[PDB]
Amino acid sequence: VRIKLLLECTECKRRNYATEKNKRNTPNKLELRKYCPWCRKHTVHREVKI
Amino acid sequence: KVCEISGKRPIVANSIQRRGKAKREGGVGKKTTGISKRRQYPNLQKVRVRVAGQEITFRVAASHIPKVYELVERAKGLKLEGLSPKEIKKELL
Amino acid sequence: PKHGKRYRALLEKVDPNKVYTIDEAARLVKELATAKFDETVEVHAKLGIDPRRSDQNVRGTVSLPHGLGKQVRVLAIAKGEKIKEAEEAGADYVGGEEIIQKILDGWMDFDAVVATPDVMGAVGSKLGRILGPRGLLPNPKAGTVGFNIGEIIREIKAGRIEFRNDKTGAIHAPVGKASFPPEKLADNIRAFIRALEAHKPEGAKGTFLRSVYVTTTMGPSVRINPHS
RNA sequence: AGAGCGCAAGGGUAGAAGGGGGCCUGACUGCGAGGCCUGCAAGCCGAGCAGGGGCGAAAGCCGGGCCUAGUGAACCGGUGGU
RNA sequence: CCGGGUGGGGGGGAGGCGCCGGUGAAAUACCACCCUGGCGCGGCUGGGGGCCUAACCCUCGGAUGGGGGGACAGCGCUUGGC
RNA sequence: GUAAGAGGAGGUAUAGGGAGCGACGCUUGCCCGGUGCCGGAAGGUCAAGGGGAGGGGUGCAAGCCCCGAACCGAAGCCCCGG
RNA sequence: GGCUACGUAGCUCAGUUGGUUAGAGCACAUCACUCAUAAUGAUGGGGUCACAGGUUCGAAUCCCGUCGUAGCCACCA
Numbered sequence: 001v002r003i004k005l006l007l008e009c010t011e012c013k014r015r016n017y018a019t020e021k022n023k024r025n026t027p028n029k030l031e032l033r034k035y036c037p038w039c040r041k042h043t044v045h046r047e048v049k050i
Numbered sequence: 051k052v053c054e055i056s057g058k059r060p061i062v063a064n065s066i067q068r069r070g071k072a073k074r075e076g077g078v079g080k081k082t083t084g085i086s087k088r089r090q091y092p093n094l095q096k097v098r099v100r101v102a103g104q105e106i107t108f109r110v111a112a113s114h115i116p117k118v119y120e121l122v123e124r125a126k127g128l129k130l131e132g133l134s135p136k137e138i139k140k141e142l143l
Numbered sequence: 144p145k146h147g148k149r150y151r152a153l154l155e156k157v158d159p160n161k162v163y164t165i166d167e168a169a170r171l172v173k174e175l176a177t178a179k180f181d182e183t184v185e186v187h188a189k190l191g192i193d194p195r196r197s198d199q200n201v202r203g204t205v206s207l208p209h210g211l212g213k214q215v216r217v218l219a220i221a222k223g224e225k226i227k228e229a230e231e232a233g234a235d236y237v238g239g240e241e242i243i244q245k246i247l248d249g250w251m252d253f254d255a256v257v258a259t260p261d262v263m264g265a266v267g268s269k270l271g272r273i274l275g276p277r278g279l280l281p282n283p284k285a286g287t288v289g290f291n292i293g294e295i296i297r298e299i300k301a302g303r304i305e306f307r308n309d310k311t312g313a314i315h316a317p318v319g320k321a322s323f324p325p326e327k328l329a330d331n332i333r334a335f336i337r338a339l340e341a342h343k344p345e346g347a348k349g350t351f352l353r354s355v356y357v358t359t360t361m362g363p364s365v366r367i368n369p370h371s
Numbered sequence: 372a373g374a375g376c377g378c379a380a381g382g383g384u385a386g387a388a389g390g391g392g393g394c395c396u397g398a399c400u401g402c403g404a405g406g407c408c409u410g411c412a413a414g415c416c417g418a419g420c421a422g423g424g425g426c427g428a429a430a431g432c433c434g435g436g437c438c439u440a441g442u443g444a445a446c447c448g449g450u451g452g453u
Numbered sequence: 454c455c456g457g458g459u460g461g462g463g464g465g466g467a468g469g470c471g472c473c474g475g476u477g478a479a480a481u482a483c484c485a486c487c488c489u490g491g492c493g494c495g496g497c498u499g500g501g502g503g504c505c506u507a508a509c510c511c512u513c514g515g516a517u518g519g520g521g522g523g524a525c526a527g528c529g530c531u532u533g534g535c
Numbered sequence: 536g537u538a539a540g541a542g543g544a545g546g547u548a549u550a551g552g553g554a555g556c557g558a559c560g561c562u563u564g565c566c567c568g569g570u571g572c573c574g575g576a577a578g579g580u581c582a583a584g585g586g587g588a589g590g591g592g593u594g595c596a597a598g599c600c601c602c603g604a605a606c607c608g609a610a611g612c613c614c615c616g617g
Numbered sequence: 618g619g620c621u622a623c624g625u626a627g628c629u630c631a632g633u634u635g636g637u638u639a640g641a642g643c644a645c646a647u648c649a650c651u652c653a654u655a656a657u658g659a660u661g662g663g664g665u666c667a668c669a670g671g672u673u674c675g676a677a678u679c680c681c682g683u684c685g686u687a688g689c690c691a692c693c694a
Contacts, residue, residue: 008451015452020398034424036399042424049451051538060537067531077618078448078694093529096509105517112529147483178484187485194488195672197681276478276674311487348589348604358485 005050011037012044051094053111055118058092065090102130106139149178150362157363164368165336168357169328175362176321181212182359184319184328186335186367189354190312192347199347202284203306204298205338207318207331211302215254218242220262225290229257232296246270255299256280256287263288278305304335306342311354319359332357332367 004023009031010016016037022028031047052059064087071084093112098105101122108118121142130138146154153175163171176182192199217234219226226237235253236242240262246253247269256279258266263281274280281287285305286295306314318331343351350369358364 010451017451018399034396036397036423038400041422042399075448077692081692082447082694090530095528100517150484182484185485187487189486193680195680197671200672272478272674309487313486315485350588354486356485361484364485 060091153362176359178361181320183317186316187356191349200308203342205304206302218253220258228293
């Protein structure tokens with residue numbers, strides 16, 4: 001439900017993506033998880049958009 | 051009707067006001083799709099000008115009145131006499 | 144009498160419908176200072192960011208690639224070790240945590256504060272009713288929370304400026320000092336334009352650069368083609 | 372093993388799936404042998420390869436949750452990119 | 454805000470003020486813009502009323518006109534509603 | 536009746552159209568909450584229009600074309616009472 | 618969706634551009650007055666100004682984020 005809602009994660013260093021979910025209710029401020037983009041190896045990943 | 055000048059007779063059905071509701075984009079469209087059909091017809095009016103030896107009227111188009119006064123100008127140039135209202139008015143043009 | 148005699152002549156030199164730009168302003172407004180001493184070029188800058196917008200009142204922290212000449216003395220509350228740094232900079236009696244009452248128990252003579260982030264916390268909670276509200280205490284962007292804020296002590300001893308918005312963007316850029324002629328006026332004003340464009344809001348539509356009024360301090364000022 | 376394993380029951384499980392701590396973020400990418408299932412469609416399962424990544428002394432596990440419900444082909448378009 | 458501020462006319466005259474100190478959030482001549490509310494105008498831009506007739510419309514024993522209404526009414530296009 | 540015009544009526548609020556009841560005798564109680572209807576020159580919402588702060592394509596440029604805020608644009612429904 | 622207004626004591630309602638010192642009638646409370654109830658006067662309990670954030674030294678008085686309430690236009694592959 002939109003409370004857990006649905007958001008996506010983009011890398012810094014210009015764009016990139018990966019598919020995820022959230023949980024605003026739970027102590028969920030923002031997120032800087034650590035994944036892999038299409039280009040190169042594993043890196044940052046920043047939280048953004050709907 | 052039909053103007054005595056440059057035609058200007060009615061228009062019907064798929065003339066239009068349609069209705070529609072129409073498409074664009076303001077989401078998936080303004081309201082997307084939208085569609086219907088209607089009716090539409092011209093203008094006409096009255097110009098009862100004197101000129102020459104008598105008085106005469108006109109069924110003038112929306113914006114073809116200066117043309118009427120022009121016909122007046124051409125009218126003055128010739129011999130417009132006797133008693134014959136629309137009869138003269140026709141010899142005009 | 145109303146605006147004085149000096150300002151009636153100095154009125155017959157404004158023609159309140161002019162521009163000058165940074166150039167003619169530099170020169171003729173270098174003249175527009177016949178009053179006392181070191182009139183501060185008061186670039187008076189006004190824009191449009193709705194006198195708060197929650198967090199859009201600039202801060203702009205600038206030195207104007209020259210110098211002022213006045214004094215701030217900083218004081219600093221720099222937890223012993225940081226005192227050392229400030230001790231080769233310009234910070235009077237740096238007092239680790241003790242010159243706090245020489246601010247709080249009524250003993251002024253200072254500006255800025257630089258202090259630290261350490262004591263910031265501590266020393267924030269004490270004088271945040273005077274230096275804070277009025278304009279000295281930390282404001283973590285007014286050159287007052289750090290040890291790289293001592294490099295900033297030299298920054299504040301070469302020019303701080305704290306561009307804020309109050310009710311009109313307003314800010315009064317300070318240099319001019321009626322002893323700088325063409326050169327330093329040109330370069331100073333242009334520099335301020337630079338820092339100006341540097342600190343920008345995130346979507347506040349309008350004229351980012353109306354009022355400039357480049358008044359020395361005692362006279363005329365009419366705009367600078369708010370750009371060049 | 373009658374406890375627990377979110378939620379209904381069923382299967383199962385203390386040689387762990389349960390309960391405590393440390394590092395983390397494999398709800399990974401490009402693919403997929405060969406099988407479940409089945410009118411179509413869709414759904415289920417997965418070794419390995421390869422990039423690189425977490426943890427592990429290693430051996431090694433990792434394509435979320437012990438598993439079965441928490442789901443909607445297409446047409447329309449919204450939004451970021453190529 | 455009943456406290457004084459703001460302005461002009463004058464008498465008359467060589468004399469009258471601003472910082473710190475003091476107080477509080479702030480210090481009060483002067484200078485810069487701006488806000489509050491107002492007031493006058495200049496650009497744009499509308500709301501409301503009167504008078505006029507000559508568009509348009511009514512009528513009176515033929516009327517080239519007199520009398521009534523009149524920029525609405527009638528209509529043409531378009532605008533949203535019911 | 537698309538219309539010209541027609542009936543109304545060469546009649547004029549004791550006159551003309553629409554509705555409920557149905558001689559005459561008695562009589563016609565409470566509710567304006569939902570709605571219909573009457574009015575009400577403050578106002579919310581909303582149209583094309585009017586306007587132009589602001590953005591873009593493109594030409595070297597002059598320019599051309601599109602997007603468009605503030606704010607003024609009705610009926611109406613909401614609102615107000617009967 | 619977009620725009621608008623309101624939500625503060627158990628009830629019902631003001632204080633609204635600050636800067637003070639958060640109220641009113643009902644009701645509860647122990648009284649007072651009357652020989653007697655009621656009428657009314659007094660003192661207390663109840664606000665946690667729709668919840669937070671930020672503006673200010675100092676907001677229930679302002680901008681902002683979430684919801685609840687309603688109003689019209691208006692969206693729904």
